[PDB]
Each structure stands twice: as C-alpha cells, then as structure tokens.
Amino acid sequence: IPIWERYTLTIEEASKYFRIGENKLRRLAEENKNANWLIMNGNRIQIKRKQFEKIIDTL
C-alpha cells in the first residue's frame, strides 16, 4: 500500500521514513512482541507512525 496511505510502516518503509538502524526496529519488535506500536501481520512486522512519528525528532 502507498506508505502515505497505510497506518503503520514496514521495516523498509520505516528504515526510509524513520531513518533508524534497521537492526533496532527488528530488535525492538522481536524484543517487545507486545509493543504498543508493533503489529505482526501474519509474519511481517510493521511500525506505527502516530505514536512513533511523534518521537522522531526526539531521538
């Protein structure tokens, strides 16, 4: 789905959009499987933009 249309970003959309070490996003989810921002769609993990996008310029 066009990144500007989904509600959550994948690791690829996140690495681009959320310029963050791809390894952290994968380590965070795999670590906080119950994260309030991660979403496992069958097998692909997705990053939330609302709760995350707010803490981007914060990092």
Automatic annotation (TrEMBL):
Gene3D superfamilies: 3.90.105.50
Keywords from the UniProt entry: DNA integration, DNA recombination, Transposable element
One GO BP annotation of this record: DNA recombination
InterPro entries: Tn1545/Tn916_Xis, Tn916-Xis
Protein name: Excisionase
Lineage: Bacteria, Bacillati, Bacillota, Bacilli, Lactobacillales
